[PDB]
């Protein structure tokens, strides 16, 4: 942080809610952009997992669940599969491009004991889940059994983020200990502890050799995978609430953090300043994703509104 | 001369507030907003003519030949004025339904009938005000020479039907509050108590409604039946418009106010 004061900061950011996606009735805990930069999913407590088109803002599929308590969702890099998980301790997988018209469930992954916090696809054959019984996993869709299980901490895992090359991920947990794992061997490689309380979201820096941790004590930090220590903490003195989701931009210059004092923010991810607030959400925000092309964000919140910015 | 000036500005400052307050923030806020909006519009579309008419000092028949402006002002008062009783009555019947059939209210009345019967009250009210427009009854100029109501003479059928249909609202209101109150007390008597504070708050706020609609629309309705069968009638419309001034205050203000 000491070296960058010779760099011209970004001045101010203005973002406008270019759409508004309406139709949910309960609150919202999820979204995930496709690699299409076009379609998103969203998961709610109505029992509905709705796939939205982000251009015409109308439904393409409204998948009806069984367990109406979902806390995460995923959308495959092949554009074929959605996943959902929650308090049922079951990760359901639905397929989209089917022979018939109606949508159906493919495989019911049923091998956890705690609830589900995240799940992210690797191929159409490998899904990595994280749970509340202090263990991640790595699954296999046709086999049905987990081919590698990571049990490296005491705190319940809360987030997950694969690398850009999809060889080793990162998971932070309720004991403030963010670990760096490895998919091939199956054991931890480093553990970073810099936070004073538990951890709600993590994503990688888009290069693949840094990551950002959002905690529940109104502070974010930026860890590096080669110096193995904290670089910045981002914190303003007028915050009480706790971060709920975190994402980066494509150039690695904006760090968008989804706070819990009713509105998101934008953090300069190199100068530790506050650029511009995504204000106007009515209830707490739960989720936000920048597209792969890097053209929008789509924040969801307990207000039943999924709004798409810039 | 100061009476329309007072009832203009006092009613305006009464009903500006509620529009602002209501706008920012259920199946009650819309049905107090549509009372507030109709109440203010009926105060803005009617007062300018009188305020203008008596600056001048000439007979209404001189300014309007052919009898169109009195026909305009004899339909507005009925229309904007009666609605208001039909905005107070609807609200009251709904407040009974809540306590008397506790679950029927949840499944069947989710804001898709608070834009239905409420925006149907105006239609019911109006397939009656336009009967002098088709030849039955007559809106004529009264003793002051600034406003208009039903001639005393088939006109009686318009004059007696106004009294009958203005009685429905008043009666419905009184029945509904007493029915609600009785049910509330009996439901609170057999306990064995914070449900008691509900009874005091409601009792107070469901008797203000029952007293305003019998200090204001009492004389205008009771004298018209005798007229069907000098100065008194003049006060009968200042009372029956004062409810409109206070309509905005009682439902969503004085309780917050104090």
């Amino acid at each position: 942080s000491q070296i960058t004061n010779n760099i011209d900061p970004v001045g101010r950011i203005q973002m406008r809610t270019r759409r508004t996606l309406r139709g949910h009735l309960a609150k919202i805990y999820a979204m995930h952009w496709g690699t299409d930069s076009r379609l998103l999913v969203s998961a709610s407590q109505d029992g509905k997992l709705i796939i939205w088109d982000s251009y015409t803002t109308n439904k393409v599929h409204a998948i009806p669940l069984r367990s109406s308590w979902v806390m995460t969702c995923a959308y495959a890099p092949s554009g074929n599969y959605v996943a959902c998980g929650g308090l049922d301790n079951i990760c359901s997988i639905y397929n989209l491009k089917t022979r018939e018209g109606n949508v159906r469930v493919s495989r019911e992954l049923a091998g956890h004991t705690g609830y589900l916090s995240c799940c992210r696809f690797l191929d159409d054959n490998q899904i990595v889940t994280s749970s509340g019984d202090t263990t991640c996993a790595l699954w296999d869709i046709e086999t049905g059994q987990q081919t590698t299980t990571f049990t490296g901490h005491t705190g319940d895992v809360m987030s997950l983020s694969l690398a850009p090359d999809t060889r080793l991920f990162v998971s932070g947990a309720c004991d403030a200990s963010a670990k760096l794992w490895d998919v091939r061997e199956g054991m931890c490689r480093q553990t970073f502890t810099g936070h004073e309380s538990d951890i709600n979201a993590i994503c990688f820096f888009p290069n693949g050799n840094a990551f950002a941790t959002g905690s529940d004590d109104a502070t974010c930090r930026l860890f590096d995978l080669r110096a193995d220590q904290e670089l910045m903490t981002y914190s303003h003195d007028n915050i009480i609430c706790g971060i709920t989701s975190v994402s980066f931009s494509k150039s690695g210059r904006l760090l968008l953090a989804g706070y819990d004092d009713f509105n998101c923010n934008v953090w300069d991810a190199l100068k530790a300043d506050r650029a511009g607030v995504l204000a106007g959400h009515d209830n707490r925000v739960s989720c936000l994703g920048v597209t792969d092309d890097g053209m929008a964000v789509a924040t969801g919140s307990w207000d039943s509104f999924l709004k798409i910015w810039n | 001369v100061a009476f329309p000036i007072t009832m203009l500005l006092t009613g305006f400052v009464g009903n500006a507030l509620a529009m602002l307050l209501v706008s920012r923030s259920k199946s009650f806020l819309l049905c107090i907003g549509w009372l507030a909006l109709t109440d203010l519009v009926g105060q803005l579309l009617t007062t300018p003519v009188v305020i203008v008419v008596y600056l001048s000092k000439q007979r209404w028949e001189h300014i309007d030949p052919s009898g169109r402006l009195c026909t305009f002002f004899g339909l507005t008062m009925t229309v904007f004025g009666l609605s208001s009783l039909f905005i107070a009555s609807a609200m009251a019947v709904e407040r009974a339904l809540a306590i008397r059939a506790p679950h029927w209210y949840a499944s069947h009345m989710k804001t898709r009938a608070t834009r239905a019967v409420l925006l149907g009250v105006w239609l019911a009210v109006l397939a009656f005000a336009l009967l002098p427009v088709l030849g039955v009854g007559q809106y004529t100029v009264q003793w002051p020479g600034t406003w208009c109501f039903i001639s005393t003479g088939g006109n009686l059928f318009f004059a007696s039907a106004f009294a009958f249909l203005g009685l429905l609202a008043l009666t419905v209101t009184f029945s509904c509050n007493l029915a609600t109150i009785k049910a509330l007390v009996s439901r609170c008597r057999a306990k064995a108590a914070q449900w008691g504070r509900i009874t005091t708050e409601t009792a107070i706020q469901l008797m203000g409604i029952m007293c305003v609609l019998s200090v204001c629309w009492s004389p205008l309705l009771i004298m018209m039946l005798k007229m069907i069968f000098c100065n008194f009638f003049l006060i009968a419309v200042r009372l029956a418009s004062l409810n409109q001034i206070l309509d905005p205050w009682v439902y969503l203000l004085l309780r917050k106010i104090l």
Partner: protein, 207 residues
């Protein structure tokens, strides 16, 4: 704006009609938690979580007997904010069976920041074992100043007023205590028709 777009928008409107129909069908159902510390007996006579669906007098409501997770209460209890009641359940035949933990749980639940409007029903399960165990042995040992008597009804009323005392700084929720004697599901029926009336009188706006 070819025929493809019009077909897509008609599909979207059919989806929204089905979505709003299912949503409206959902809201005439009384979601209810089933928190606890003899829950099995209660759910009999009335992994993950289990939802039990049953209908009484033209009013079918589900019931979410959570308790198989045992991971953390701080992280998934805020998905339960919109709920009508909480059928809390404690057997009172365990005053000296190695009740303070139950009182701690009730203190943590009744004062929670997501549940300042939910009317906590409470059930007290095992009464025959309690009266035999109080006829045989006294209960002046949970506190050294617990009871000033040793009969059944004074002890039962003392325990009931002891659980109803932990309601800290609330005059918006109403504990409906019972003793688990047809007339065991009748009580939740007659105590859920008393919280939806409280809610209607706040809906139409009256207090």
């Amino acid at each position: 704006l070819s025929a493809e777009d019009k077909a897509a928008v008609e599909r979207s409107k059919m989806i929204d009609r089905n979505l709003r129909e299912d949503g409206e069908k959902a809201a005439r159902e009384v979601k209810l938690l089933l928190l606890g510390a003899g829950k099995s007996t209660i759910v009999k006579q009335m992994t993950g979580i289990v939802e039990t669906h049953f209908t009484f007098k033209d009013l079918h409501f589900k019931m979410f007997d959570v308790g198989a997770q045992r991971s953390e209460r701080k992280k998934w209890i805020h998905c339960f904010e919109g709920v009508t009641a909480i059928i809390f359940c404690v057997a009172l035949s365990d005053y000296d069976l190695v009740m303070h933990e139950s009182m701690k749980l009730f203190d943590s639940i009744c004062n929670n920041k997501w549940f300042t409007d939910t009317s906590i029903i409470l059930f007290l399960n095992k009464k025959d074992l309690f009266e035999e165990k109080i006829k045989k042995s006294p209960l002046t040992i949970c506190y050294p100043e617990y009871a000033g008597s040793n009969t059944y009804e004074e002890a039962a009323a003392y325990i009931q007023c002891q659980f109803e005392d932990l309601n800290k700084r609330k005059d918006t929720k109403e504990i409906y205590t019972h003793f688990t004697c047809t007339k065991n599901v009748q009580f939740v029926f007659d105590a859920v028709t008393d919280v939806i009336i409280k809610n209607n009188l706040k809906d139409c706006g009256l207090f």
